Write a protein that holds these residues in place. Structure first.
Motif, PDB file in Angstrom:
ATOM      1  N   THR A   1       0.813  -1.209   0.000  1.00  0.00           N
ATOM      2  CA  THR A   1       0.000   0.000   0.000  1.00  0.00           C
ATOM      3  C   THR A   1       0.850   1.264   0.000  1.00  0.00           C
ATOM      4  OG1 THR A   1      -1.551  -1.304   1.297  1.00  0.00           O
ATOM      5  CG2 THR A   1      -2.015   1.034   1.027  1.00  0.00           C
TER       6      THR A   1
ATOM      7  N   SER B   1      -6.980   2.173   1.312  1.00  0.00           N
ATOM      8  CA  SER B   1      -6.711   3.175   0.298  1.00  0.00           C
ATOM      9  C   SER B   1      -7.655   4.345   0.546  1.00  0.00           C
ATOM     10  CB  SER B   1      -6.898   2.587  -1.100  1.00  0.00           C
ATOM     11  OG  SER B   1      -8.266   2.625  -1.440  1.00  0.00           O
ATOM     12  N   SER B   2      -7.725   5.250  -0.408  1.00  0.00           N
ATOM     13  CA  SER B   2      -8.665   6.350  -0.350  1.00  0.00           C
ATOM     14  C   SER B   2      -9.862   6.039  -1.231  1.00  0.00           C
ATOM     15  CB  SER B   2      -8.000   7.654  -0.777  1.00  0.00           C
ATOM     16  OG  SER B   2      -8.967   8.679  -0.920  1.00  0.00           O
TER      17      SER B   2
ATOM     18  N   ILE C   1      -9.923  10.473  -4.697  1.00  0.00           N
ATOM     19  CA  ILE C   1      -8.714  10.946  -5.350  1.00  0.00           C
ATOM     20  C   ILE C   1      -9.065  12.162  -6.189  1.00  0.00           C
ATOM     21  CG2 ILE C   1      -6.715  10.281  -6.678  1.00  0.00           C
ATOM     22  CD1 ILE C   1      -9.020   7.514  -5.985  1.00  0.00           C
TER      23      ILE C   1
ATOM     24  N   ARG D   1     -13.159  12.255  -7.272  1.00  0.00           N
ATOM     25  CA  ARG D   1     -13.744  11.482  -8.360  1.00  0.00           C
ATOM     26  C   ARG D   1     -14.225  10.097  -7.961  1.00  0.00           C
ATOM     27  NH1 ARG D   1     -10.150  12.868 -13.774  1.00  0.00           N
ATOM     28  NH2 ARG D   1      -9.877  15.103 -13.339  1.00  0.00           N
TER      29      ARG D   1
ATOM     30  N   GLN E   1     -12.902   6.620  -7.452  1.00  0.00           N
ATOM     31  CA  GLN E   1     -12.723   5.345  -8.135  1.00  0.00           C
ATOM     32  C   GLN E   1     -13.214   4.226  -7.208  1.00  0.00           C
ATOM     33  OE1 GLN E   1      -8.447   5.198  -9.002  1.00  0.00           O
ATOM     34  NE2 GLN E   1      -7.977   4.430  -6.943  1.00  0.00           N
TER      35      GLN E   1
ATOM     36  N   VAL F   1      -9.960   0.074  -4.629  1.00  0.00           N
ATOM     37  CA  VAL F   1      -9.041  -0.951  -5.111  1.00  0.00           C
ATOM     38  C   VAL F   1      -8.991  -2.194  -4.232  1.00  0.00           C
ATOM     39  CG1 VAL F   1      -7.577   0.565  -6.447  1.00  0.00           C
ATOM     40  CG2 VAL F   1      -7.263   0.385  -3.995  1.00  0.00           C
TER      41      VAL F   1
ATOM     42  N   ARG G   1      -8.346  -6.234  -4.991  1.00  0.00           N
ATOM     43  CA  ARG G   1      -7.348  -7.095  -4.374  1.00  0.00           C
ATOM     44  C   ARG G   1      -8.003  -8.260  -3.652  1.00  0.00           C
ATOM     45  NH1 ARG G   1      -3.332  -6.659  -0.209  1.00  0.00           N
ATOM     46  NH2 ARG G   1      -3.694  -4.440   0.219  1.00  0.00           N
TER      47      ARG G   1
END
Lengths: 1056, 97, 396
Positions: B43, B69-70, B73, B76, B78, B81, B85
């Motif tokens: 990470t 994660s965030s 970003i 937006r 996304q 992630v 994973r």
């Protein structure tokens, strides 16, 4: 290694470069089973994150086998259309800086600055300089990015570079204080980047690599050959107050001279660096050192500062102002120049004789030293016993032929009883040993393999009848195609059973054929021949395969079909030759040695005379094998010539294929005319077998226990291994080996990933010459400064220092390439062999009570002073050498004076001296030849110079046997020529021009009226003893001329 | 050799195998690296300025490992992630079984 | 393979203290840095690699014919291993493994061989049907294999001496070599630098002179013809050599020779010895080669600049080469840029690209090298009545 940032600086308006045809890479593949794929060009920042799974790139780094090539290509193409970067084009020119972009893609937009990117990717663009000023003013955090090394399929960041918020120096020191593992260059890029490592001992290797690089850079700067770049120096700075790392970095800038074979011979180099960095505290803290003494102050400074960079006087001229304000023009380098080994090929040493100082053998309290030592295995560097006996194929067919030498041929009871006594006498064991200690048959196998594998794939051409077309026609079955040039495609099945008789028979065929008529080729368009060998299965097939246009009639007789069939009475053969054939050959040993009684002797003589009668009644020319071969038999033969047929004549012949040391010979019969001799009395061959010799077949030793003892001649070869961990035993080992071996051969390996498991090798052969030359080693006023031998033996104290030993440990010991077929039994040419036999018996004809005959040894004919093996009086006797070109010097520690001048043969001869001379009076003083009359005139010159207790020696060719050769085979080492076809004979030694051999009669009359001067002739008991007391046997392109040369030269001694 | 179950591994110079980078690991024996890879976090090591800037007690230039994660970003959003994973992990494991 | 050869120029040969002290003073003098720079600023070894690649890739697919003994048949016999087939014309099919390690000495040795061979007897080919030769190089692994691959009908005897097996082996006293030549060979060659430059004292000078005279004695006592590498090369040494000709052998003579393979700016030379007759000169006084090394020069090894900041200044000679890029969006800077570049560079080279699907991202290039001639011709640019219509230079 580090900061491979090379300012690639691609331009924004060309980032559509992406669709490049599979951006250039670098494949490799080794036994580590890795699949490493380096990335060439501007693409060393891309890291296949946990995305790209199921892409081809992943699923190929599980292919265990070797990686095909096209896979790389198409998979890269499939990958490149997935990878992408952020950019924006606008008016004007801009560079992209290619670093934050790759990074914020390298990590998929998770660190704060990536937000400054993904939301607005113009900040990546930048004009002429400072791609970071806007960023830093906008964010105000230090920026950290990683470097993921080569071999893409790795993702662990081995280290991390880190950019500073304030490009000034103060900020550099500040940020360097924290971050417990850090380093930075001296290049201006310092202002923009610091390093951060992972561990304590990850620094060491990076620092050492950078140091090696700084060595290379200093070198290439010395000659002003600086590449199109910058970065004056490569070394680093750090604040780690670690004793070890500071020791390294302090001792480093004093060893910026040598070259360290960077990564091409990578090695204990770094381990050696660390060791030598440690081996100074034993010197800079204690007294009694090579500190000399100021290096203390300088080294203490370098070790205590950590801030200054010390630049040798050259580099300082370039490091200007814009870096660390901490530097100094260092100088006064430490003097250690170390050599570097070449590629894996090994290293040879040439231990000297001239010096100025000595080194000690075992500690100054004790006599004899004994280095009981280990040995090497045989799975390591092997032992070849194969004696190279042949150059190009011609050397497999040469021959030599001798003619009669007397006008009578009558068997006398004297010669008969001579031969009989010789027959019932047992042979000499050494002689048995010399022609059975193998190999020679393996030697022709070598040239056969050569020509075979060469014509198959090798660029070798056979013109269908050449000697080669015979040679590959050997050991090859049904594999020849003649398109007027011999080609081999298939059916390559190859014969077996070349049991040393095939070669003799085929060489006899080629000799008899060449002698029959002209040498237009080795193919007659139709012929006939027979064979009398005890077993000839192959020869028939060999020849029948060699012609192809058969038109022949070949058949062998007397083949009972036994493998090692002894010769026993062999008689039922003659009523079988009712053919009237052409050329005839016979290979029958005829050497029964079991209860040698006169009855068997007589019947075997009758048998051989029968074979000769048969061959001469039949076809014109044809050899026969003689194995006795006393002239008594030859006398009887030449007698039976009379009363039976004609003026037909006989000849003696030796073959190049024949094994060297045998008594064997061949007798050639022809129907032609005779040169009015018809009788044999004096001939070299017969003068060989008629000797009752008895000897010891001494042989090599592979001992591995060196001793500081002068044990004269075993002989032997030394061989062992020592380690590199400590260097005080390897030095003394190599020296006490040098007192015994003129040449040393060392090979080093490394198995233990560091200095442990060193395994350095040593191997050499003990030569008599070095023993003789170091027997004296006086350098003293009749005192034991190099002596005090114990009871009976002689032991040494101090050794001529070896020049370059200490400065060769990091590298310079070879690396054991493919075979390293280091041998045991050595080959020597016939010329050197005869030189040894004279440095022999010369040394034995020294008269008793003339051994205390001091003083002056005067030697002419020097040129490596190899005659020293002929003198054992190097105890209290100085030597002066007068000879040809060669730097004149004086050797104070061995009482040897070297003087270069012609010496004119005409000077004073003081009382109580000695004068040796070999081949000296043979040669043109200015270029003009020397008649035999001139030669005996010079001998007369020397005769008058007797000196009342001073003898002298000389060698001379005697021409006694040259007058009846009449057939030669164009040798390359011993030629012979007749002038006006018979006046005097000129002989060409191995390379030099012809020389006028002295005629016999003048020497006869001289020795007749000398009254105190004698002639010494040589015999086997002198050549066998030298061949058994000194290593090496025979067989360098000679090995059949032996007899002739042994009978050519004589030696003349002059006492009064 | 039945590897011992508990062991004094992480503290001191004795690292556990099966977790080196060493792509040779992947080459020699697949279906093992194809697991070990599915476990490494990968990470970040984002430092913690706001912690030290109040003079809390921290080793100078410390860090941490946000396991996740965030989702914002640049505003937006996304698709998180970690979901990927996780999903590929499940998929691979069931394919193997 | 070309060469050049010079003959004696005087009738006497006697070492005088004048020339000896001349040579000694030159020896202890440090070289000129610029000279060091010129024969180290690379490449030249890379240049022969180019022609080797050319001939190799040409014969492979290229229409190139070698008649099995041509100079080319040597050239592709370089850097190629076990890949030659002789069907009276050299063809390469497989086994195309290629050598490494052409470290600039292979070429000198092979050119010396071809020169000595051509000079020996007629130039019918580069193949004798049987020969002999030796080598004195400090490291000769490749040359032996090169030649043994070049013949094919071997009938030879080649072996090199003095190979301790070190990569960059310096020359150090090199003496244990002469009691090893008991062969009586044919053509002999020797590539030993013999240029120790470390604490240049007279003792080392004398002993190195004795050494080179020893090598010459050895080669002349042995085979007819054969070169030797001279690296001093003051005529004082050559005087001593021509002296030692006297009192020793014969009317045999000496020659100086330069090779086309030799690196351009070196002081190096080769000395060729032959057993033939002499043209009644026997002495060297005036010769071009020796008149080169006997100079105590001191200079600055100035080098190029790749600056990209044009200035309307007559800065005379750096020298340098200008190189940069401008855009196409507006055209008032490109014009002036090209002109103020033209006042400095006789030739300009421009290249344009288009990445931005339109006029944006223009990226036009400019590159040239500053020539002294244009500076000289535009120093004047008067067209005026002694007024600054093209002048009013500032201070200096």
């Amino acid at each position: 290694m580090i900061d491979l940032r090379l300012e690639e600086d691609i331009l924004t308006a060309t980032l559509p470069e992406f669709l490049s045809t599979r951006p250039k890479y670098r494949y490799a593949y080794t036994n580590t089973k890795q699949q490493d794929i380096r990335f060439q060009g501007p693409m060393r920042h891309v890291r296949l994150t946990h995305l790209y799974k199921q892409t081809k790139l992943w699923n190929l780094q599980y292919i265990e086998r070797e990686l095909a090539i096209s896979e790389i290509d198409d998979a890269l193409d499939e990958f490149i259309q997935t990878f992408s970067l952020p950019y924006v084009i606008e008016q004007g020119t801009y560079k992209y800086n290619m670093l934050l972009g790759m990074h914020a893609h390298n990590v998929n937009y998770q660190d704060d600055v990536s937000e400054l990117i993904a939301n607005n990717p113009q900040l990546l663009n930048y004009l002429d300089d400072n791609p970071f000023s806007a960023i830093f003013e906008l964010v105000n955090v230090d920026l950290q990015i990683y470097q993921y090394g080569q071999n893409i399929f790795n993702n662990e960041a081995e280290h991390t570079i880190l950019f500073l918020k304030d490009n000034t120096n103060y900020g550099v020191i500040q940020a360097l204080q924290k971050h417990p593992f850090s380093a930075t260059h001296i290049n201006w890029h310092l202002h923009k980047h610091i390093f951060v490592f992972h561990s304590r001992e990850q620094l060491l290797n990076k620092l050492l690599s950078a140091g090696l690089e700084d060595s290379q850079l200093y070198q290439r700067q010395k000659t002003y050959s600086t590449k199109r770049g910058d970065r004056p120096t490569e070394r680093m700075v750090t604040y780690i107050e670690d004793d070890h790392i500071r020791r390294i970095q302090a001792v480093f800038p004093l060893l910026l001279d040598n070259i360290f074979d960077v990564k091409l011979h990578k090695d204990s180099s770094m381990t050696w660096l660390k060791s030598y960095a440690d081996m100074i505290y034993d010197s800079v803290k204690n007294s009694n050192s090579t500190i000399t003494p100021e290096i203390r102050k300088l080294y203490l400074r370098m070790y205590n500062q950590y801030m200054r960079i010390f630049l040798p006087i050259e580099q300082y001229m370039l490091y200007d102002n814009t870096c660390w304000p901490f530097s100094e023009k260092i100088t006064l380098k430490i003097n250690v120049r170390l050599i570097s080994s070449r590629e894996n090929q090994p290293v040879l040493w040439k231990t000297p004789i001239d010096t100025e100082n000595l080194i000690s053998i075992v500690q100054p309290d004790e006599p004899i030293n004994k280095l009981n030592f280990t040995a090497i295995p045989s799975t390591m560097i092997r032992l070849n016993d194969n004696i190279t006996m042949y150059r190009a194929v011609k050397d497999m067919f040469s021959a030599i032929e001798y003619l009669p030498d007397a006008i009578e041929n009558i068997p006398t009871l004297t010669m008969k009883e001579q031969a009989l006594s010789r027959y019932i006498s047992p042979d000499s064991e050494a002689q048995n040993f010399f022609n059975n200690q193998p190999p020679y048959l393996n030697s022709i196998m070598n040239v056969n393999r050569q020509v075979f594998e060469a014509v198959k794939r090798g660029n070798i051409q056979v013109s269908t009848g050449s000697m080669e077309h015979l040679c590959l026609c050997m050991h090859v079955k049904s594999g020849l195609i003649v398109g007027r040039t011999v080609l081999i495609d298939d059916k390559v099945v190859l014969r077996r059973n070349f049991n040393a008789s095939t070669a003799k028979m085929i060489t006899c065929y080629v000799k008899a054929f060449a002698q029959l008529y002209g040498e237009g080729s080795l193919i007659n368009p139709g012929l006939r021949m027979v064979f009398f060998g005890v077993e000839t299965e192959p020869a028939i097939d060999i020849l029948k395969l060699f012609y192809g246009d058969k038109s022949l009639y070949i058949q062998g007789f007397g083949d009972r079909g036994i493998g090692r069939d002894k010769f026993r009475t062999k008689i039922e053969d003659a009523l079988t030759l009712r053919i009237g054939c052409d050329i005839l050959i016979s290979d029958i040993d005829q050497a029964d040695y079991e209860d040698p009684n006169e009855e068997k002797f007589d019947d075997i003589t009758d048998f051989v005379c029968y074979v000769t009668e048969l061959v001469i009644s039949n076809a014109t020319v044809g050899l026969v094998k003689i194995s006795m071969p006393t002239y008594y038999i030859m006398n009887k033969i030449s007698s039976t010539l009379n009363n039976k047929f004609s003026n037909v004549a006989i000849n003696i012949v030796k073959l190049s294929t024949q094994k060297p040391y045998t008594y064997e010979a061949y007798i050639m019969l022809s129907h032609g005319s005779t040169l009015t001799n018809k009788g044999y009395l004096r001939n070299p061959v017969c003068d060989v077998y008629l000797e009752k010799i008895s000897l010891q077949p001494m042989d090599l030793k592979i001992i591995s226990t060196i001793s500081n003892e002068i044990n004269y001649d075993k002989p032997t070869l030394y061989r062992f291994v020592v380690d590199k961990n400590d260097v005080t035993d390897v030095s003394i080992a190599m020296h006490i080996l040098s007192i015994h071996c003129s040449t040393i051969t060392t090979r080093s390996v490394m198995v233990r990933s560091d200095n442990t498991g060193a395994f350095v090798t040593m191997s050499g052969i003990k030569d008599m010459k070095r023993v003789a030359i170091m027997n004296r080693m006086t350098d003293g006023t009749s005192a034991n400064s190099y002596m005090h031998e114990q009871n009976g033996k002689l032991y040494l104290q101090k050794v001529p220092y070896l020049e370059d030993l200490i400065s060769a440990f990091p590298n310079g010991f070879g690396s054991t390439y493919q075979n390293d077929y280091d041998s045991s039994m050595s080959v020597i040419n016939v010329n050197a062999l005869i030189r040894q036999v004279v440095y022999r018996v010369i040394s034995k004809s020294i008269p008793v009570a003339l051994l205390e005959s001091l003083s002056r040894i005067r030697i002419i004919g020097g040129r490596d002073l190899g005659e020293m093996n002929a003198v054992y009086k190097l105890y209290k006797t100085p030597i002066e050498v007068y000879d040809a070109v060669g730097i004149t010097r004086e050797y104070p520690h061995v009482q040897i004076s070297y003087r270069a001048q012609r010496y004119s043969f005409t000077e004073s001869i003081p009382n109580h001296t000695l004068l040796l001379a070999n081949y000296v009076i043979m040669n043109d003083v200015d270029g003009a030849p020397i008649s035999s009359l001139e030669q005996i005139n010079t001998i007369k010159k020397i005769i008058s110079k007797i000196s009342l207790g001073s003898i002298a020696y000389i060698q001379v060719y005697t021409d006694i046997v040259a007058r009846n050769i009449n057939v030669m085979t164009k040798n390359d080492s011993f030629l012979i020529s007749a002038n006006a076809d018979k006046t005097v004979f000129k002989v060409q030694v191995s390379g030099y021009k012809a020389v006028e051999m002295c005629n016999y009669e003048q020497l006869l009359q001289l020795v007749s009226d000398n009254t105190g001067v004698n002639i010494i002739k040589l015999t086997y008991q002198d050549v066998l003893e030298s061949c058994v007391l000194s290593s090496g046997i025979l067989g360098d392109t000679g090995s059949w001329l032996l007899d002739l040369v042994l009978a050519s030269t004589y030696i003349i001694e002059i006492r009064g | 050799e039945r590897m011992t179950e508990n062991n004094d591994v992480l503290t001191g110079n004795l690292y556990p195998s099966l977790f080196t980078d060493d792509p040779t690991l992947s080459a020699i024996a697949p279906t093992l690296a194809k697991i070990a890879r599915l476990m490494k976090p990968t990470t970040s090591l984002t430092p913690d300025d706001r912690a030290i800037a109040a003079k809390f007690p921290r080793f100078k230039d410390s860090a941490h490992l946000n396991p996740y994660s965030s989702l914002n970003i640049g505003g937006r959003t996304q698709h998180s992630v970690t979901y990927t994973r996780m999903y590929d992990a499940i998929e691979e494991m069931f394919n193997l079984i």
